Design a protein around this ligand. Structure first.
Ligand code: I93
Ligand code: MG
Ligand code: MG
Ligand code: MG
Length: 708
């Protein structure tokens, strides 16, 4: 084999080399010490990791059995308490996490999430700290393409005028003038450290002069004006000779928004990595990001400004980077033990993404965390014992890397039921590591379906978004964060907007999240980060949070309200739509996962809306159908017929891609098609409804076949 023996471990050579040749150089960690550390940490922690998965299994078994005889909430709740699922609430406390950067403790704004395996996308995400508001308005449906204002091959001035007026209005609302409207500005100057805006008849300053943050060029004719509102920067670019500037009353070329404040470079649900070669591609991108030399094009430099009073200063040109490790479940043959057993991938991720993140603590030839923290999102944890395990894992990794204890900070996904109901105790277990909690509502829906699989038929996938359990889950998450002192200390975050082309709807709708006191929320693209930033200028999240302090808005009974469908909820046409819709989203995602190793794709649904799909959306679609099949809402022939009906549609959607292999008409010769079918027909048997076991197995099967 092409493997390296270190103690009880046999490491894939490609990984061994990457680490020694790329990762370690620059850290002052002795490769021998490092690799002995890995060996020791894997040996020491594997048994507990396994004991934690066995616990999940024991609890799920008891819940399945409970439902199988034959809904009284008192009885159910007492049952969960007995089996140790629902634990006592601990006493009130405040988190003590220290050494966290401002982007996290203080600044409320969008949080962008991107697959680390795609270098181009990850570079765009890192650079998304700043984004053009004009581009985001012009290029999306936020400005409707009504008669006259449609996008063409060239610049539509009528449309550009609409974009300009939208932004003027945004300016009036965020940084108001003492008198008049930005809409009437004829120019800008800096006089005695204050911003002066020329109107046709008079001149005026800002209603709040402190919102003036700096400028570029000469004070007497600046090339830009930097402002600030709710801790977020806005930069007005001034160039009267530019395409847009020429048409503007004040020569304004663009409005730039501080957009993606933080970014999550994702190793988990948005990527497909099933072996060492895949993991190294990812690790190598994460490395390039932390050393600042990743190029595919390049990472942006910081931005230079002149303070209003006079001095020179700099603002970060890049988003503060988190890394999302995989969770406690999967193994990966990147490392196997002497018996040939695969090593836990979560343990590996901590060691390797942690090692790599050390580079982001030093200057590149610039520094991710100026305060000396490494920020790791840990997904899919079930309850506070699993949180304590991750804390212990990070502690041992810190020892191996020779980092101070508590350098490795954790972002907690609240996306499993047993975490939701024990949320306070989960935060407590990580009281000195936590830098965010976040409602991963898609995985959480998946877990909701799977946990109560045996209870009865669930409501339709779309209906889930408005069910009592989920509304209480969202409020409870904010309540718990605030009560543990998150305000000024840690992010309270909410979930992803998946409809990538429906920006007008996002701008209208997603404002609900900061209005709920979330200091951040997930977006799938730089464009959507710039647009979601608008919401943070409209809502003073700090003030919302202080207004919510000490409120308890969700009860345990609400949280435990199982989304069962009522008697006779659906007509045959409604059931057919749901099945077609779920099969098409599943097929669309899985075919690119299994055949091309693409972990995140835009897949248009049955209504032709483009959805950004990843494993969590897959978990829902597959679990929901598995539930309907388990309870006789639909037959196995309904499932089959639907898969066979949507497959050619999916083939058509991919008809370009040179690397695409049609699934139709020889379905059963397609490894991707069979993966899709297995996800549904075996869904009920997957641990907590997880999709990884099947995706990994089939993706590996496909690679192996391609090599013959
Ligand atoms: C890029 C992307 C697209 C869709 C998603 F659902 C996600 C999440 O990964 C969601 C999530 O954790 C949760 O809701 O469970 C991503 Cl990143
Ligand atoms: Mg998730
Ligand atoms: Mg305000
Ligand atoms: Mg089971």
């Amino acid at each position: 084999t092409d493997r390296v023996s270190v103690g009880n471990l046999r490491i894939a050579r490609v990984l061994y080399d990457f680490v020694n040749n790329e990762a370690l150089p620059g850290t002052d960690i002795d490769p021998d010490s490092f690799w002995a550390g890995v060996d020791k940490v894997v040996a020491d922690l594997t048994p507990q990791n396994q004991a934690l998965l066995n616990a999940r299994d024991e609890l799920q078994a008891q819940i399945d059995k409970w439902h199988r005889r034959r809904i009284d909430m008192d009885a159910y709740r007492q049952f969960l308490t007995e089996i140790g699922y629902l634990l006592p609430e601990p006493d009130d406390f405040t988190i003590t996490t220290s050494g966290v950067d401002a982007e996290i403790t203080t600044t409320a704004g969008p949080q962008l999430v991107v697959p680390v395996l795609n270098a181009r996308f990850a570079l765009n995400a890192a650079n998304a700290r700043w984004g053009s508001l004009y581009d985001a308005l012009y290029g999306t449906d936020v400005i409707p393409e009504t008669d006259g204002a449609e996008k063409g091959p060239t610049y539509n001035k009528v449309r550009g005028d609409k974009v300009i007026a939208y932004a003027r209005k945004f300016l009036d609302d965020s940084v108001p003038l003492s008198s008049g409207s930005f809409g009437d500005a004829t120019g800008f100057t800096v006089q005695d450290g204050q911003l002066v805006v020329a109107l046709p008849d008079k001149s005026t300053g800002l209603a709040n002069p402190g919102q003036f943050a700096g400028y570029t060029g000469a004070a007497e004719s600046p090339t830009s004006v930097l402002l600030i509102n709710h801790g977020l920067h806005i930069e007005i670019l001034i160039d009267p000779e530019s395409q847009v500037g020429t048409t503007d009353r004040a020569g304004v070329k663009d409005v730039i928004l501080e957009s993606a404040i933080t970014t999550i470079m994702d190793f988990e649900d948005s990527v497909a990595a099933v072996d060492a070669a895949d993991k190294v591609l990812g690790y190598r991108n994460w490395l390039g990001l932390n050393k600042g030399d990743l190029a595919a094009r390049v990472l942006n430099r910081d931005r230079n400004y002149t303070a209003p009073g006079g001095g020179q200063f700099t603002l970060p040109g890049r988003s503060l980077m988190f890394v999302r490790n995989v969770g406690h479940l999967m193994t990966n043959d990147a490392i196997v033990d002497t018996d040939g057993s695969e090593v836990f991938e979560g343990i590996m991720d901590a060691l390797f993404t942690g090692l790599i993140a050390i580079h982001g603590l030093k200057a590149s030839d610039l520094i991710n965390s100026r305060t000396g923290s490494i920020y790791i999102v840990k997904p899919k944890m079930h309850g506070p014992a699993e949180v304590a395990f991750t804390c212990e894992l990070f502690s041992r990794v810190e020892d191996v890397l020779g980092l101070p204890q508590n350098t490795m900070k954790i972002g907690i996904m609240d996306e499993e039921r047993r975490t939701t109901v024990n949320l306070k105790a989960c935060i407590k277990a990580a009281a000195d590591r936590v830098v965010f909690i976040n409602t991963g509502f898609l995985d959480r829906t998946g877990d909701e379906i799977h946990t109560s699989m045996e209870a009865g038929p669930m409501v339709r996938k779309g209906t889930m978004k408005s069910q009592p359990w989920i509304l209480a889950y969202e409020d409870h998450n904010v309540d718990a964060g605030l009560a543990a002192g998150f305000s000024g200390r840690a992010q309270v975050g909410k979930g992803m907007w998946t409809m990538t082309e429906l920006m007008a709807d996002m701008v209208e709708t997603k404002i609900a999240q900061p209005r709920a006191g979330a200091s951040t929320a997930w977006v799938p693209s730089p464009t959507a980060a710039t647009l979601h930033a608008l919401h943070y200028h409209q809502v003073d999240v700090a003030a919302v949070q202080q207004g919510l302090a000490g409120k308890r808005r969700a009860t345990i009974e609400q949280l435990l309200t199982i989304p069962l469908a009522k008697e006779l909820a659906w007509a045959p046409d409604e059931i057919r739509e749901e099945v077609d819709n779920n099969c098409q989203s599943i097929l669309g995602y899985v075919v690119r996962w299994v055949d091309q190793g693409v972990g995140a794709s835009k897949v248009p649904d049955i209504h032709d809306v483009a959805l950004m799909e990843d494993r969590a959306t897959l978990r829902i679609s597959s679990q929901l159908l598995a539930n309907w099949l388990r309870h006789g809402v639909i037959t196995s022939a309904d499932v089959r017929a639907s898969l066979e009906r949507m497959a050619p549609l999916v083939d058509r959607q991919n008809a370009g891609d040179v690397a695409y292999r049609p699934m139709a008409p020889n379905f059963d010769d397609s490894i991707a098609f069979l993966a899709a079918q297995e996800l549904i027909l075996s869904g009920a048997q997957q641990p907590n409804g997880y999709t990884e076991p099947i995706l990994h197995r089939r993706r590996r099967e496909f690679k192996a076949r391609a090599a013959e």
